Amino acid sequence: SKYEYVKLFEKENYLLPDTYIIIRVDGKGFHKFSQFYEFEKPNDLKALQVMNSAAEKLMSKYSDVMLAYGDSDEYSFLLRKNCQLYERREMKLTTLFSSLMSTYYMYFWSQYFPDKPLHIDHLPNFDARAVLYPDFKHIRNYFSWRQVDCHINNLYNTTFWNLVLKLKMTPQQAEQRLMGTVASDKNEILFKECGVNYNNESEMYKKGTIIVREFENYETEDEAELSKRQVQRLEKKRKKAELKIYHVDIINDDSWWKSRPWLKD
Amino acid sequence: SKYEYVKLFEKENYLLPDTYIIIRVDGKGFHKFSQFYEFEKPNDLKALQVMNSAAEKLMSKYSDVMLAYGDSDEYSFLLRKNCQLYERREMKLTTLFSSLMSTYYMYFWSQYFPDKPLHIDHLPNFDARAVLYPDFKHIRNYFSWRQVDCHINNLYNTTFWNLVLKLKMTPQQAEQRLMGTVASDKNEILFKECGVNYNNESEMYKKGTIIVREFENYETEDEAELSKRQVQRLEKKRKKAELKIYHVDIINDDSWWKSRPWLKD
Amino acid sequence: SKYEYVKLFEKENYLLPDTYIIIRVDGKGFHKFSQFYEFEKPNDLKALQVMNSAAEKLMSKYSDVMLAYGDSDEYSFLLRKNCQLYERREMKLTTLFSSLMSTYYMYFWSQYFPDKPLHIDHLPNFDARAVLYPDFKHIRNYFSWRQVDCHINNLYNTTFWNLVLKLKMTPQQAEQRLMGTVASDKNEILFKECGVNYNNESEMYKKGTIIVREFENYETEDEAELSKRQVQRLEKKRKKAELKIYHVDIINDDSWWKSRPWLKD
Amino acid sequence: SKYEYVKLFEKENYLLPDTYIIIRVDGKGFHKFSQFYEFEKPNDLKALQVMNSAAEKLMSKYSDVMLAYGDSDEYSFLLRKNCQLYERREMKLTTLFSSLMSTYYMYFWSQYFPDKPLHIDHLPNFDARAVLYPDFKHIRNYFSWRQVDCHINNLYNTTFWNLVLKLKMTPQQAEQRLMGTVASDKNEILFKECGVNYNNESEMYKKGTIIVREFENYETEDEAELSKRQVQRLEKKRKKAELKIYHVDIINDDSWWKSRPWLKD
Numbered sequence A, B, C, D: 001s002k003y004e005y006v007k008l009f010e011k012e013n014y015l016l017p018d019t020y021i022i023i024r025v026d027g028k029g030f031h032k033f034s035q036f037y038e039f040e041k042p043n044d045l046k047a048l049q050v051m052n053s054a055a056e057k058l059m060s061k062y063s064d065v066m067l068a069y070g071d072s073d074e075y076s077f078l079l080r081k082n083c084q085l086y087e088r089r090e091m092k093l094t095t096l097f098s099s100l101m102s103t104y105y106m107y108f109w110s111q112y113f114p115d116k117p118l119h120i121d122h123l124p125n126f127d128a129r130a131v132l133y134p135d136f137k138h139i140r141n142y143f144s145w146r147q148v149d150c151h152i153n154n155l156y157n158t159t160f161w162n163l164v165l166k167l168k169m170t171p172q173q174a175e176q177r178l179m180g181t182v183a184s185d186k187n188e189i190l191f192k193e194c195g196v197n198y199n200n201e202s203e204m205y206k207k208g209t210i211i212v213r214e215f216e217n218y219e220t221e222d223e224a225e226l227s228k229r230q231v232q233r234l235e236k237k238r239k240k241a242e243l244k245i246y247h248v249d250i251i252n253d254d255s256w257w258k259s260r261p262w263l264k265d
């Protein structure tokens, strides 16, 4: 062929070996998406379960995914540092994750909301990015970062929508009322003025959602030395593992991580 | 925050300015997908119509897409060289396209196949890659490359699948019969033994599908010099331009390209 | 070997085919360097000749370099569009150019400055970066950018040092006198206050230095179609072409570029 | 300015934070270089000392370099994992190192070989590449890798050249004699045929050269929390710490590495 040379213009990006990979997916324009389909505000319970169902399905399909954290319209997936899925090609990994979440979300949406058929100009789409982390302390810090943001965003939105719904404020006056406020202020506004105790909100709303792969007889046998069938049996054992869902603090509960050593290696 | 530092590990890739971008999407495991959902062989008309509807819909949402070419389970989209969609971020462009094609396919499938509901373990997924080409001659050669591949593959599958169904050969025997064969050989087997004239095959099957944006009073006004209201008005005309579908040779027809100068600019 | 695996952590960057490469080199910490060895101000003639000699020697060794532009402590080298030097590896190209410039400068320094032996803590070091340009119009604009930069800095330095040297102003007052001034203002300060006609300054100081590869019987014979020994013959011809130095405008003189079409190929 | 837009085509590459950086420099065409200047064989003592001085000089100016290893025409530099030199820009780091090693070599060459002035067509040039390693075990294995290669090449070259110089063999007969041989065969050839004990070779020749930053009162005082003035005092101590040279096994002497914990941080 006189034309096949054009293949030489392609550039693959192989992610640095032996590094933890985070794949973060985030809904595109989900403010508009959540408005169009009338999410309950501040939080739509069934909408989050769709995200979570989507995430668990993806995670059960790919044994390299060790840990998942989701809230709002985002999910973060931790791939083990020795992951060889698609030879660690960033193009493959990211475009497959954004494709899967889109389609899994679309599938499960038709299950949970049969009376809200999707409009062609409002299908659920997601982006995806890969981030490399060379040390597990950065992994701890990454998920702590994301859970802290969930708290802040959930506290704000719960406060915001209660100002609108309980006090019959317009969005603009709700926003202005909150400018200049810290976490303790919003809590006071919610309790004293709206009659809502934030601490009594659902654990899923306050903490977000953790989906983690659970192993029973784990020994830190995973090493560079052993290979071939050992790797393949380990691939099989990872596939035949169980997914558990939690709504807990992972920021300050160090024992939670320590009792799950397969996350680091 | 003591954790937000983790954002610094993210790495963006901004694609070289003033260069043509090709985004190519390809179905994940569509051999299996086409078997599970019982596609007609060698070509399933409605399946391609699902593909064609998706790409046209995608292309109509994004005025920077000037031209698209599809055959089998793939589509290639040409972005104009001064495209600023998502600031030419490689991650954004590819994960958006893979997500869009995925959901549009899923949407249109339910239109064309109400009697074949999608199964959760067989959803339509796509990869997506971006390729840069610094000269339009490479764009012509790229699409020539894909259409030639369309010709070769359709001929093989038409010959292959007529050998199994008409001559009652097994898969191995048809493949074995074809080992060592060129186009004229395949063409003769079709004519003389199977009683099929390849030239009488649908133009879409032979040539594939081209979706192109058409302009009527085009002048090469596009230059770096004019700006402000000038550019946004042309952006408005690009969205309000028409997409026409063709099943024609674009390999050897220079006049086809020459009469479409907006492809170059 | 159980340790040779570490080679797999290396990541090569192959620069996009069929694109103009600009390699720009700029002296590291040459302000201090020029002070340490007591360079003449604003311009040291023998100092610029060391740079030009270094660059020309480099350019005569690497036939892929079609054009070079230098001023101050910098040189830019244009690599032909179809350059395959080190397989277009960015690492090889840039670290080779910075090393070459550093040692050639050092060699020629000992030629031009026998009376100023180099001190180990003040050796001439250079960085180097590669930049891709998909269209020759950006190459024209690149060199225009640099020559304008040359004019601006030379005009400033000539004005600055005439304020210090003729009018016995302090550096601080010379610097404060010029803040907020455009070219017409600086020209007058030189004329009315310093009695200097800027146009009588050396052409090299005003315009910088262009080193160009010159061909006599050139025909645009270059195409993908011609190959094998034909390309090898074109390499010998390119290696053995004459290098000419100019101190002229290249910003506005379109005819200068048009009569040297091999730069575009 | 209408031409300054061309700056936007530049692409920086910021190396992953919190990862070990190895920089390896290697002499360009040093086979030919060592012939032209008539190096002693197998090992030229003064030529290696030129290399060692360059590396030691380079290392004393840049305190982020924690360890260096050299043999033949190569030197590898370990940058501490929290290095912020040039904001971890790969282009700056590599072209600085290739320039520095080249000029330091040229400088020190004139000190050790006043009687062998450098010819302009045979100056000492170096390439340079940055390699990332996410775990310190790879740093150990890297230097193990390079020292093993030094052993292999020095044992071979010493045996080879003793065959040529002592037994008056031609290069070709010496080469075939060594084809198919492991270390014990080569050692025996040295012992039984040439009367040379390899173990009595200089430690520098056998092991290469290790340059290490030595700390006396080191505690792993480095953490993310400590910053500002703590870091500036720490930077000053690293700069004014002492460089010690060793010619010892670092492959298998774990206690050697273990007693130097500042290497991991």
Ligand SMILES: Nc1nc2c(ncn2[C@@H]2O[C@H](COP(=O)(O)OP(=O)(O)OP(=O)(O)O)[C@@H](O)[C@H]2O)c(=O)[nH]1
Pocket (backbone or CB within 6 Å): A004, A005, A007, B026, B149
């Ligand atoms: N010339 C050339 N063509 C290739 C190469 N690899 C794949 N192709 C062809 O390019 C077409 C596009 O398919 P791709 O999906 O991009 O190629 P692939 O083999 O699937 O590689 P990946 O999908 O990236 O894993 C296919 O029909 C392949 O036959 C290659 O390395 N060189």
Ligand SMILES: Nc1nc2c(ncn2[C@@H]2O[C@H](COP(=O)(O)OP(=O)(O)OP(=O)(O)O)[C@@H](O)[C@H]2O)c(=O)[nH]1
Pocket (backbone or CB within 6 Å): A026, A027, A028, A029, A030, A031, A032, A034, A039, A040, A041, A042, A043, A044, A045, A047, A048, A071, A072, A073
């Ligand atoms: N009502 C409601 N809205 C939600 C819920 N989850 C996510 N959202 C919407 O998603 C948004 C999350 O913010 P972002 O993801 O950062 O912004 P975005 O609108 O998705 O736009 P992008 O930057 O393109 O991702 C919120 O502002 C909400 O409007 C939910 O459970 N209920």
Ligand SMILES: Nc1nc2c(ncn2[C@@H]2O[C@H](COP(=O)(O)OP(=O)(O)OP(=O)(O)O)[C@@H](O)[C@H]2O)c(=O)[nH]1
Pocket (backbone or CB within 6 Å): A026, A149, B004, B007
């Ligand atoms: N520290 C820091 N955090 C940011 C920055 N930009 C966004 N974030 C936060 O990071 C979270 C992840 O959102 P992203 O999708 O990565 O950022 P974005 O603003 O949507 O920008 P995109 O990359 O185009 O999607 C957001 O909810 C923001 O709160 C930033 O520049 N610095």
Ligand SMILES: Nc1nc2c(ncn2[C@@H]2O[C@H](COP(=O)(O)OP(=O)(O)OP(=O)(O)O)[C@@H](O)[C@H]2O)c(=O)[nH]1
Pocket (backbone or CB within 6 Å): B026, B027, B028, B029, B030, B031, B032, B034, B039, B040, B041, B042, B043, B044, B045, B047, B048, B072, B073
């Ligand atoms: N029978 C039939 N098969 C089709 C049709 N369209 C696509 N296919 C199948 O899709 C395949 C296209 O090849 P690829 O996309 O390169 O292979 P793949 O199964 O998608 O595997 P990947 O490389 O992961 O994409 C063909 O082998 C066909 O079997 C169709 O209209 N009819």
Ligand SMILES: Nc1nc2c(ncn2[C@@H]2O[C@H](COP(=O)(O)OP(=O)(O)OP(=O)(O)O)[C@@H](O)[C@H]2O)c(=O)[nH]1
Pocket (backbone or CB within 6 Å): C004, C005, C007, D026
């Ligand atoms: N295991 C392995 N070793 C290699 C490979 N390529 C080169 N090496 C070795 O690595 C050592 C370092 O040499 P380098 O200069 O980095 O590699 P090179 O052969 O010179 O190639 P370049 O320098 O990139 O032009 C050499 O002695 C090579 O034998 C490889 O692909 N795999």
Ligand SMILES: Nc1nc2c(ncn2[C@@H]2O[C@H](COP(=O)(O)OP(=O)(O)OP(=O)(O)O)[C@@H](O)[C@H]2O)c(=O)[nH]1
Pocket (backbone or CB within 6 Å): C026, C027, C028, C029, C030, C031, C032, C034, C039, C040, C041, C042, C043, C044, C045, C047, C048, C072, C073
């Ligand atoms: N006296 C004199 N000084 C010169 C001459 N050429 C270059 N220089 C000095 O070199 C400087 C070049 O500035 P830059 O290259 O932008 O900065 P730098 O000092 O080289 O250091 P970097 O920013 O790291 O590149 C000028 O300001 C002068 O001080 C010369 O011909 N004569």
Ligand SMILES: Nc1nc2c(ncn2[C@@H]2O[C@H](COP(=O)(O)OP(=O)(O)OP(=O)(O)O)[C@@H](O)[C@H]2O)c(=O)[nH]1
Pocket (backbone or CB within 6 Å): C026, D004, D005, D007
């Ligand atoms: N328009 C524009 N000009 C720049 C920019 N950065 C630097 N310049 C100017 O362009 C000239 C090119 O020199 P550079 O070496 O690329 O600039 P620099 O600041 O030294 O950048 P680094 O050496 O990479 O740190 C410099 O003298 C700057 O004055 C920029 O981001 N935009």
Ligand SMILES: Nc1nc2c(ncn2[C@@H]2O[C@H](COP(=O)(O)OP(=O)(O)OP(=O)(O)O)[C@@H](O)[C@H]2O)c(=O)[nH]1
Pocket (backbone or CB within 6 Å): D026, D027, D028, D029, D030, D031, D032, D034, D039, D040, D041, D042, D043, D044, D047, D048, D072, D073
């Ligand atoms: N006689 C002698 N030769 C040496 C000495 N040190 C290095 N060399 C020469 O340097 C060469 C090193 O090989 P390489 O670095 O892989 O190849 P190169 O000649 O530098 O060329 P490149 O691969 O482009 O870097 C050896 O083959 C030797 O001939 C020395 O101490 N004495």
Ligand SMILES: [Mg+2]
Pocket (backbone or CB within 6 Å): A026
């Ligand atoms: Mg976002």
Ligand SMILES: [Mg+2]
Pocket (backbone or CB within 6 Å): A026, A027, A028, A029, A030, A073
């Ligand atoms: Mg979002």
Ligand SMILES: [Mg+2]
Pocket (backbone or CB within 6 Å): A026, A027, A072, A073, A074
């Ligand atoms: Mg979000």
Ligand SMILES: [Mg+2]
Pocket (backbone or CB within 6 Å): B026
């Ligand atoms: Mg493929």
Ligand SMILES: [Mg+2]
Pocket (backbone or CB within 6 Å): B026, B027, B028, B029, B030, B073
């Ligand atoms: Mg496919």
Ligand SMILES: [Mg+2]
Pocket (backbone or CB within 6 Å): B026, B027, B072, B073, B074
């Ligand atoms: Mg395909």
Ligand SMILES: [Mg+2]
Pocket (backbone or CB within 6 Å): C026
């Ligand atoms: Mg600079």
Ligand SMILES: [Mg+2]
Pocket (backbone or CB within 6 Å): C026, C027, C028, C029, C030, C073
């Ligand atoms: Mg400089």
